[PDB]
Amino acid sequence: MIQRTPKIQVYSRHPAENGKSNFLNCYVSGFHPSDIEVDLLKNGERIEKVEHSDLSFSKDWSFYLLYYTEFTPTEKDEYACRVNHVTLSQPKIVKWDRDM
Amino acid sequence: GSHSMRYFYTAMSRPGRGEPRFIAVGYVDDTQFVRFDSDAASPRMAPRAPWIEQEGPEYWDGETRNMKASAQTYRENLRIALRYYNQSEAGSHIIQVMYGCDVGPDGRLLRGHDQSAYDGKDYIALNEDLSSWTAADTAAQITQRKWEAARVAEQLRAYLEGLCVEWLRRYLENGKETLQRADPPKTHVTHHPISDHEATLRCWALGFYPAEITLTWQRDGEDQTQDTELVETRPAGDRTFQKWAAVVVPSGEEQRYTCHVQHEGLPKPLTLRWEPH
Amino acid sequence: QASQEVKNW
């Protein structure tokens, strides 16, 4: 069965400036089948209250989901998104880079 | 301009872990407005946009009854698919359905859709005539013959031409302040040195709706699509969208690169350069 | 509003 690995984008809702409230987003898309596990990390540990959109899919039938949480960026803290899928040998970690 | 309504169904069997799950979402253009999840404690069609909340209890009770019956239907459809493809009970499989109507500026129906997939591949689709089907394989031809015999396409043509168009025109009116309001992107170019001789130019587009947008990099007016990294348009989380395009340029050539932004919320296309000051 | 037409495979 054709299996498609997820694309991953980690980003803030608004341009980050340290000390001001924002939203941390992890957008996973282009994957199949639908079974996927997404976690937002702060300093390597899981953020506890994370919400996600309802499962939908694109015209090519590949699924997409948005995971998000409220956060306040700082200089000391490192944020990341961790994705597990059947197509992956290890959970893929994408670090949040305010330039992307 | 043009508008569309779409419903997306996902039915997924989970052998040995639980009953098959059924998830439905509805969209007007690029705005989700309803959802249903059979895994919820009280499975209900629920609002996901402000302009749909004004619908009365008959609407929400009716949508919930439909979604509950649809979930049973696709649980059975998953079993039927195992028959057609001679697959075992051990594996997890997925049926996906998307259907809806496209209307023009005149509110007239432009095109109806009713497409089904099995395990992420085309299964059967209602044709543009809204009267015949296209089956992707011999299994789906079994379904096609059943739907021809039961005159299924006539029933969907009636929905796509009638209730689909009428409800969409009404949703568009109730949510006119957001659905028929195009937000232009807010744009800027960033500069990120890679070494002392190379730098990334990234052209940003933020806070725009709808999602359709064109971002391109030019060098001396020449398109650089082959050397441009273009990320997928992504949701900001507030029903607006983001996108960026980046090129690696040799140090000293930055001012010869222009970013061009096309979006219907713009009075006319943008041309951006890196603005150090 | 979602379509109510039943699709039996």
Enumerate residues 6+ apart whose C-beta is below 8 A from A15: A98, B206
Q: For residue B4, what are its two tokens?
A: 């569309």
Interchain contact, A25 vs B121, CB within 8 Å: no
Q: Which residues in chain A have Cβ-Cβ distances shorter than 8 Å to B37?
A: 54
Of C2, C4, C5, the CB nearest to B152: C5
Q: Which two tokens stand for residue B116?
A: 């089904």
**Looking at chain C, which residue has its C-alpha nearest residue B99?**
C3
Output DSSP code: residue A5: P
> By the 8 A CB rule, do A52 and A39 touch?
no
Selected for mutation to probe chain C from B163, B166, B170, B172 (highest C CB count within 10 Å) is B163
- B86 conformational bin, left if phi > 0, alpha if psi -120 to 50, beta if neither: left
* B4 close to B29: Cβ distance less than 8 angstroms: yes
Taking each helix axis from N to C end, the angle separating B138-149 and B152-161, rounded to the nearest 10 degrees, works out to 80
Please judge whether C3 and B156 are an interchain contact, meaning their C-beta atoms are less than 8 angstroms apart: yes
Q: How was this structure determined?
A: X-ray
Closest to B186 (Cα-Cα) out of B229, B224, B243, B239: B243
In chain B, what are the domains? 3-180 (3.30.500.10), 186-272 (2.60.40.10)
With an 8 Å Cβ cutoff, are B152 and C3 in contact?
A: no
Structural domain range at position A91: 1-100
Domain count, chain A: 1
- Give yes or no for a contact between B114 and B96, defined as CB atoms under 8 angstroms apart: no
The data reach a resolution, in angstroms, of 2.1
H-helix or E-strand spanning residue B61? helix B57-85
The whole-angstrom separation of Cα B232 and Cα B235 is 10
d(CA A68, CA A30): 18
> If residue B141 lies in a helix (H) or strand (E), which one and from where to where?
helix B138-149
Answer whether A55 sits within 8 Å of B25, measured CB to CB.
yes
